[model samples]
Target: GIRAATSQEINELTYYTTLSANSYCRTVIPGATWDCIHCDATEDLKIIKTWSTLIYDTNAMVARGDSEKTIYIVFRGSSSIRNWIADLTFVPVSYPPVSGTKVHKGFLDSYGEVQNELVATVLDQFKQYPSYKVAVTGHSLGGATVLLCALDLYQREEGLSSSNLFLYTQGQPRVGDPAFANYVVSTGIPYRRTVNERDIVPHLPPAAFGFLHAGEEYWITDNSPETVQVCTSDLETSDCSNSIVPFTSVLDHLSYFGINTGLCT
Candidate 1:
């Protein structure tokens, strides 16, 4: 069985992860309605360019702090798969020019660069807190980033402790072929994938095109104590009643920090 992270570790990890995730969203998805209301630290605004040119202020602050606890890093997804496809093509690798397909070579390469920078920043800060573990997490496209980041760590011999890495992704699409998923799972790292029923993002490239293995599945609507049922086995049944619920259309997505009630079951 896997060891669970301590409450204080989880809390501190979640705090920094949310900070980094929000900072990433501010630059990558500027139009996103969700803003970081709790982020008052000035370091959250600084940007760092490494593998893919992303803001590193949040990471810097979290690393510099005295807290010696496990860390959780969260990433956000792009608005559309098409956008992801476009972004991937700009990378140096030769990506297949296929629309609505899961195996976009360029996309994975670009994701690798982004993942490298995030992990590098964490490693730099981790020197200060050698006793704590590090985990990578994200939603949608960000989930893909976490997966790539884990792979990068696995490839390295000294930088990361494989046992310390964990990945929790929500509504993630297939980032690579079947072999990639197998490789990630074989690494002995914890990768928990949560998905709402019938989320189109997870089904992108469609099940007919490829298969996605979500480690764990959660029904946000059914489990939600404060809101109406927002998830259904049928893709057409999910709906978002309020502005706060994470949704692209009628499909309700899982929140990185749980629901607005702040209660995570």
Candidate 2:
């Protein structure tokens, strides 16, 4: 099935609005300090869904006061589950070197479970606001999490429809391999990936080891004078390259997620 298209005006408007709102909210409620791991499943689910919704809408440019409430709930619920994963002990599996470093079925399952829980929470919250459909989005690690969540939902016989999900990820590394990325992109899900000029993490899990392909790719440069121009680009496949630049501080790796730098707000 083909993905649905929105008007250019709606797309452009959503782009800026979502980015600004996300930056604001992440500043207001930083995920690193506000740990969701301690919360019970029910509470955590609410938080994760709320956080996911907020980030998703903010990235899409459709955030509003009422929608903000929805975003909050989704994020809170999703965060709780993610926190649980971070806190849990992962039993690493031994896979062939062909699978890339640290790639294992056990690890994937553990991650998948957390993602599933977040999706369920989001869907429940999604029912509360029938007027607007939920969009799946994230940056860096969060972007990978969103992709996994969408895949889990798609596999379920009866669950959130894949069409309702839209993925907009920024500087996300290769989660698995070419097959995995291709499978997700081919599932007829609408996804767009954005990358900064020199971000290095997106190149990891190495394409030579099998990770390749980006459904739709956009490039943004920090030196750009215009905010809107940063988002306009056609999707293309490119060799994921290593970073020629070096981080001046420990926080540089997480600059996209707005950790410590106060850029999120």
Tell me each candidate's RMSD, in Å, in order: 9.1, 9.6
Q: Give candidate 2's error at residue 51 in angstroms.
A: 9.4
> What TM-score fits each model?
0.59, 0.55
Best by TM-score: 1
Tens digit per residue, CA lDDT, model 2, 1-265: 1222234633543342234224334422444222232222112122332232332322111222253333321111122322423343323343332233333243354344455445565555556665544565555545555556556666663434555556666555566554455456556766666555566545554435555444555443342232212222222353322333343222333343222111332
Name the runs in model 2 displaced over 4 angstroms.
Answer: 1-110, 157-159, 227-236, 239-265
lDDT of each: 0.45, 0.42
Task: Please count the clashing residue pairs in each candidate, in the order shown.
Answer: 0, 33
Prediction 1 TM-score vs. true: 0.59
